[PDB]
Amino acid sequence: VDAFLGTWKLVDSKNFDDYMKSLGVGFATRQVASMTKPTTIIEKNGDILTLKTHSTFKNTEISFKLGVEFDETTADDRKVKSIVTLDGGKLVHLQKWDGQETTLVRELIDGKLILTLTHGTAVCTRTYEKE
Numbered sequence: 384v385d386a387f388l389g390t391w392k393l394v395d396s397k398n399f400d401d402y403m404k405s406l407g408v409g410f411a412t413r414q415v416a417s418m419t420k421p422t423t424i425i426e427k428n429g430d431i432l433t434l435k436t437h438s439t440f441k442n443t444e445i446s447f448k449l450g451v452e453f454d455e456t457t458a459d460d461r462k463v464k465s466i467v468t469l470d471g472g473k474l475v476h477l478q479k480w481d482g483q484e485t486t487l488v489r490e491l492i493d494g495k496l497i498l499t500l501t502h503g504t505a506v507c508t509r510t511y512e513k514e
């Protein structure tokens with residue numbers, strides 16, 4: 384997990400609108416979200432990880448242990464059951480609610496952090512650079 388730790392800024396995004404649409408996020412919030420460039424902070428204290436996502440629009444913070452289910456309230460106000468694990472060197476976050484599921488996968492490639500979000504048929508790729 385150590386190579387993911389630090390402060391990351393968004394530098395590219397593909398298909399985030401499709402992803403938000405698939406989740407049912409309304410047009411007005413999609414507008415503002417398409418113009419926001421979040422900062423993601425990942426820190427560890429022992430076996431507890433904390434992931435903060437800061438922007439001018441909304442902010443989120445979750446703390447979890449790898450492999451242990453937790454309740455999460457997402458930025459779009461879903462209440463889901465979450466689990467984060469390390470899989471092939473990727474940080475894999477699975478959210479489940481109402482019989483549905485979405486995955487948020489983070490991998491390090493050439494020193495950049497690539498976040499892939501999948502729900503239904505929609506796939507979004509977001510690229511973060513280390514600050």
Ligand SMILES: CCCCCCCC/C=C/CCCCCCCC(=O)O
Binds near residue numbers: 423458
């Ligand atoms: C919460 C801080 C950034 C919020 C941006 C707008 C959110 C609007 C609704 C989004 C629903 C999908 C939630 C997950 C998106 C994560 C984006 C990222 O970490 O790159």
